[PDB]
Amino acid sequence: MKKDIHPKYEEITASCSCGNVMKIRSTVGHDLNLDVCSKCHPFFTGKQRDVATGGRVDRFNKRFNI
């Protein structure tokens, strides 16, 4: 790479609230703080909870119950 023209591509430690510590290299500065990662994100459960939302007949039966 052309030295001088690029910004400082330094190593840093990512550490989310979940507990997954993870060293990477990027143009940020000193340290990082994250919310979610590839692990801990609700997509494997998300699709299970999102798809199974509908249901009108049981909602009627829960009110009447007879």
Partner 1 sequence: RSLKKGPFIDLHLLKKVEKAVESGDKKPLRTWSRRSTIFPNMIGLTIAVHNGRQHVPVFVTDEMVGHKLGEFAPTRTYR
Partner 2 sequence: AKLHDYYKDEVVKKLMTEFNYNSVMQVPRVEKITLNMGVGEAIADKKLLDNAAADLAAISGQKPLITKARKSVAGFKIRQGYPIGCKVTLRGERMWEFFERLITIAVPRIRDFRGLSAKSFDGRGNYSMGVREQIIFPEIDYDKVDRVRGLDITITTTAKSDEEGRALLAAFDFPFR
Partner 3 sequence: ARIAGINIPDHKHAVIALTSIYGVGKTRSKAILAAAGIAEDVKISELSEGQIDTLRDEVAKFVVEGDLRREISMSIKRLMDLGCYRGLRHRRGLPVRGQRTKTNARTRKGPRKPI
The nearer residue to partner 2, 27 or 60, going by C-beta atoms, is: 27
Q: Which of 3, 23, 30, 63 binds RNA (CB under 7 A)?
A: 63
Q: Hey, how many other C-beta atoms are within 10 angstroms of the C-beta on 3?
A: 5
**Which positions ≥6 away from 15 have C-beta within 8 Å?**
21, 22, 31, 32, 33, 34
The nearer residue to RNA, 8 or 62, going by C-beta atoms, is: 62
Binding piece for RNA, criterion CB under 7 A, among 15-23, 28-36, 40-48, 56-64: 56-64
Q: Is 62 among the residues that bind partner 1 (CB under 8 A)?
A: no
